[PDB]
Symmetry: none
Subunit: 67 residues, 2 copies
């Protein structure tokens, strides 16, 4: 007959892994709007190679690079 | 003497057909990978308010801001 284990709630729980802070921004040709990026916080991190940069916006004046 | 005239001629003329002028990049929390942006050219434009900035990547070393 074979008591085949195909029915079992092996899952200990149901952790909703939901990256809500995942923002999808688009680039038109090679252009982009700053507000799309800084829609939540006023600083963005940019990984390149092995090092990490920070693109930051100031008050409402302009934006700059920082580490 | 086997008789069999093949009729299988579904030619895969359609290839890629995936243009990337409008590039959709995502942000994880507030982080992003530089290569996603500079996937085509090595300079990106960023509009903020009424003025326009340029985020540029160098050779493969690092990235900077420029106007």
């Amino acid at each position: 007959m074979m008591t085949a284990s195909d029915r079992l709630g092996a899952d200990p729980t149901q952790a909703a892994s939901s990256p809500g802070g995942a923002r999808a921004v688009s680039i038109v040709g090679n252009q982009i709007d700053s507000r799309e990026l800084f829609t939540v916080d006023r600083e963005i991190v940019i990984a390149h190679g092995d090092d990490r940069y920070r693109l930051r916006l100031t008050s409402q004046n302009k934006l700059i690079l920082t580490k």
